[PDB]
């Protein structure tokens, strides 16, 4: 392989490449713009060790105390029906609502799976609201507490617009502790310093700072209680041991234990109370977009390379000429039930066909007669197109041309010429017609034709009748050229029967559909039946940047 | 055209020195 080929392949598949990469980048944009932002707050603690303090900070006792203090077991979620409603609502700048709830008790269904009772509260105004558990609709009002049907509830300070809905869950205490723990991190950053960095991430920029402050306060107030206690145990013992110099000695010791109890400041000190970084730490938009674009490019390039290594069709006449097959022409796609050589006589395809005509005028000398047979390997390769247009172009030069549609199975030439469908080729071959009622005139052409006629049940066996050769011998004395259109050779054997009487035979190979293998097989199958194929005609060519085989398929005039 | 960036420095003596770095960069 070389660089020019791969550059050409990318240029040719640019449409697919752009489409795939743009779709991937669009999904990356959507995700990076709709994912819920995550803020992070931190605090700094000084230790007057530091290995067990990490484990004590993340203990269930301290976190549980924080949860009990701040009621983290009442979970409130603004309701958006889709997995994108929250993100879009944020994008339009809509302010999310919040509700203060200070007392909650659900009936605690507690089935096998759903251990977490929940309700839905719809806000109706600044004061009242509707509550539904499983369709049980109730009305409540801010202020007054509610106890109905085994639900106790107290709501304060609704801050939202009417019509909003909120999911309210009363999750178990241990679940709340686990949720708090998974978002809470502690590090040492010095491996010897009394420095601990506490970090907490969450979706609410203020709630996380409040939670981290509460955690720090609980830990600190717990720590000093430890030091105060052992002094307090000593102070209690001395007081219990009180029964005069020793009497004064214990009193002075008691005061020293009293002052040591009150001077609490000890091993733990709060350097920095928690604050929240206003820039969310997730999602990291730029890296998301870069990964999206790179992924799009990689998958597109792999897909293109895949398609290149699985492509097998013919691409240039050089492929056919390596095997030893003469390519007499290359016809491009005509982007333009009428003969092309009549509707648009200046088309590029008709120019290529004129080139083919001049090639034939030299190839068909020293042919045993003036009969030309066009065939092909696979159906819808262009045999009828080529044959009909070639007949038209040869006819406009003042030579008498006869076009025979010997495709007794799917021939539609009569439709494309304007027809009297009676008395086709079938009726002549079967013996129920003469040679004169079958020949018809093309209107916009200038040549005669013979249509197939009625589809017979035994096409291949009809073509073996000697009346066919009689017809060819008779017509070869009244016309300058006879063109015969035939079915494919890989499908049926009609072409190989007809080719016995044809002076010249050509194959039509469709540009990207057929492969070299079919063409070689077709040539060999024609040879085995005693038919010598002059050469091939490549049809349906389009411009490929990767080709480096380059035609005269451009307008000149 | 880039704006020039000057640098200033000072020297401090600790009579350690691992936690003092974290104290200096603290928010207080
Ligand atoms: N180079 C071409 N440009 C435009 N249309 C073409 C070209 N080659 C074939 N066709 C059209 O595609 C269809 C298939 O060709 P056709 O000759 O009818 O099939 P077959 O070769 O099996 O007889 C036809 O409608 C034909 O008009
Ligand atoms: Mg055909």
- B19 in contact with A, Cβ within 8 Å: yes
Task: Give the resolution value in Å.
Answer: 2.7
- Angle subtended at Cα A66 by Cα A64 and Cα A67, rounded to the nearest 5 degrees: 65
Q: Write the CB contacts of A162 (distance below 8 Å, at least 6 apart in sequence).
A: A123, A124, A125, A126
Cβ of A535 closer than 6 Å to ligand 1, yes or no, is no
End-to-end Cα spacing for chain A: 38
CB–CB contact B27 A44 (8 Å) = yes
Strand partners, A206: none
- A190 in contact with B, Cβ within 8 Å: yes
Broken C–N links (> 2.5 Å) in chain B, after residues: 15
CB–CB contact A275 B27 (8 Å) = yes
- A272 in contact with B, Cβ within 8 Å: yes
Cβ of A385 closer than 6 Å to ligand 1, yes or no, is yes
> Are A45 and A268 in contact, with CB atoms under 8 Å apart?
yes
Spatial distance between the Cα atoms of A539 and A551, rounded to a whole number of angstroms? 13
Spatial distance between the Cα atoms of A104 and A369, rounded to a whole number of angstroms? 104
Q: What is the DSSP string of A500-519?
A: GG-SEEEEEEETTTS-HHHH
List, in sequence order, the alpha helices (H) in A36-131: 51-57, 60-70, 85-91
- Angle subtended at Cα A484 by Cα A478 and Cα A488, rounded to the nearest 5 degrees: 170
Q: Write the CB contacts of A262 (distance below 8 Å, at least 6 apart in sequence).
A: none
Residue A481 has what DSSP assignment? E
Q: Write the CB contacts of A489 (distance below 8 Å, at least 6 apart in sequence).
A: A375, A376, A377, A495, A496, A522, A525, A526
Method: cryo-EM
> Are A174 and A137 in contact, with CB atoms under 8 Å apart?
no
Among B18, B22, B23, B27, the strongest candidate for a mutation testing the A interface, having the largest count of A CBs within 10 A, is B22
C-alpha distances (whole Å) from A77 to each of A189, A221, A465, A526 are 36, 32, 88, 78
Cα(A436) to centroid of ligand 2, in Å? 24
Q: What is the DSSP string of A342-372?
A: HH-TT-HHHHHHHHHHHHHHHHTTT-SSSEE
Spatial distance between the Cα atoms of A229 and A261, rounded to a whole number of angstroms? 8
Nearest to A27 by CA among A292, A302, A297, A291: A292
Cβ of A374 closer than 6 Å to ligand 1, yes or no, is no
Q: From the centroid of its chain, how far is CA A279?
A: 32
> Are A403 and A481 in contact, with CB atoms under 8 Å apart?
no
Residue A477 has what DSSP assignment? T
> Are A44 and A197 in contact, with CB atoms under 8 Å apart?
yes
What kind and span of H or E run contains A452? none
Strand partners, A153: A104, A146
- Examine residue A283 and say whether the peptide bond preceding it is cis (omega within 30 degrees of 0): yes
Cα(A379) to centroid of ligand 1, in Å? 10
CB-side neighbour CA atoms (13 Å) of A12: 17
> Are A211 and A77 in contact, with CB atoms under 8 Å apart?
no
> Are A413 and A484 in contact, with CB atoms under 8 Å apart?
no
Residues in B touching A190 (Cβ below 8 Å): 18-19, 22
- Residue showing tokens 């005269």: A552
Spatial distance between the Cα atoms of A291 and A306, rounded to a whole number of angstroms? 22
- B28 in contact with A, Cβ within 8 Å: yes
List, in sequence order, the alpha helices (H) in B1-28: 18-24
Per the annotation, does A363 bind a ligand? Answer: no
Q: Write the CB contacts of A126 (distance below 8 Å, at least 6 apart in sequence).
A: A142, A158, A162
> What does DSSP say about strands A504-510 and A535-541: parallel, antiparallel, or unpaired?
parallel
> Are A30 and A158 in contact, with CB atoms under 8 Å apart?
no
**3-class DSSP state of A433:** coil
């Amino acid at each position: 392989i070389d660089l020019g080929r791969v550059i050409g392949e990318l240029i040719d598949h640019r449409k697919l490449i752009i489409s795939i990469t743009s779709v991937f980048t669009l999904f990356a944009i959507l995700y990076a713009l709709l994912a819920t932002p995550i803020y992070e707050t931190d605090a700094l603690i000084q230790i007057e060790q530091s290995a067990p303090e990490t484990a004590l900070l993340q203990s269930r006792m301290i976190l549980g105390k924080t949860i009990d203090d701040l009621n983290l077991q009442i979970q409130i979620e603004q309701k958006y029906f889709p997995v994108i409603g929250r993100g879009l609502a944020r994008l339009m700048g809509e302010k999310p609502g919040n509700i203060d709830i200070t007392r909650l008790y659900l009936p605690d269904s507690d089935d096998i799976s759903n251990n977490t009772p929940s309700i839905i509260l719809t806000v109706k105004d600044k004061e009242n609201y509707s509550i539904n558990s499983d369709g049980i609709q109730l009305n409540g009002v801010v202020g007054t507490l509610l106890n109905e049907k085994g639900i106790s509830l107290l709501v304060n300070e609704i801050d939202a617009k009417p019509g909003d809905q909120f999911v309210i869950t009363q999750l178990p205490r241990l679940k709340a502790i686990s949720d708090l723990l998974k978002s809470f991190s502690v590090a040492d950053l010095g491996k010897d310093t009394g420095m601990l960095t506490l970090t907490l991430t969450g979706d609410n920029p203020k709630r996380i700072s409040h939670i981290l402050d509460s955690i720090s306060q609980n830990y600190l107030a717990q720590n000093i209680a430890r030091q105060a206690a052992q002094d307090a145990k000593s102070l209690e013992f001395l007081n219990q041991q009180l029964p005069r110099a020793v009497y004064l000695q214990l009193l002075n010791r008691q005061q020293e234990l009293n002052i040591a109890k009150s001077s609490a400041i000890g091993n733990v000190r709060i350097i920095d109370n928690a604050v929240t970084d206003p820039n969310p730490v997730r999602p990291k938009k730029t890296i998301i977009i870069v990964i999206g674009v790179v992924l799009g490019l990689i998958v597109s390039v792999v897909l293109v390379l895949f398609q290149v290594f699985l492509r097998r069709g013919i691409e240039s006449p050089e492929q056919l000429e390596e095997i030893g097959i003469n390519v007499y022409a290359s016809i491009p796609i005509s982007e333009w039930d009428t003969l092309l050589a009549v509707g648009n006589p200046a088309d590029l395809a008709v120019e290529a066909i004129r080139g083919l005509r001049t090639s034939l005028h030299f190839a068909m000398m020293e042919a045993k007669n003036n009969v030309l047979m066009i065939s092909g390997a696979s159906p819808s390769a262009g045999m009828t197109f080529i044959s009909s247009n070639l007949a038209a172009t040869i006819a406009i030069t003042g030579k008498k041309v006869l076009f025979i549609d010997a495709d007794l199975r799917k021939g539609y030439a009569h439709k494309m010429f304007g027809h009297k469908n009676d008395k086709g080729l079938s009726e002549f071959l079967s013996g129920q017609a003469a040679a004169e009622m079958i020949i018809d005139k093309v209107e916009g052409g200038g040549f005669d034709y013979i249509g197939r006629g009625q589809i017979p049940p035994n096409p291949a066996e009809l073509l073996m009748h000697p009346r066919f050769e009689q017809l060819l011998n008779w017509a070869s004395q009244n016309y300058d050229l006879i063109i015969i259109d035939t079915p494919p050779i890989l499908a049926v054997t009609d072409a190989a029967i007809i080719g016995r009487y044809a002076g010249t035979c050509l194959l039509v190979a469709r540009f990207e559909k057929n492969t070299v293998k079919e063409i070689d097989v077709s040539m060999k199958r024609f040879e085995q039946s005693g038919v010598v194929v002059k050469g091939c005609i490549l049809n349906g060519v389009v411009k490929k940047a990767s080709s480096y085989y380059r035609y005269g398929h451009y307008h000149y005039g």
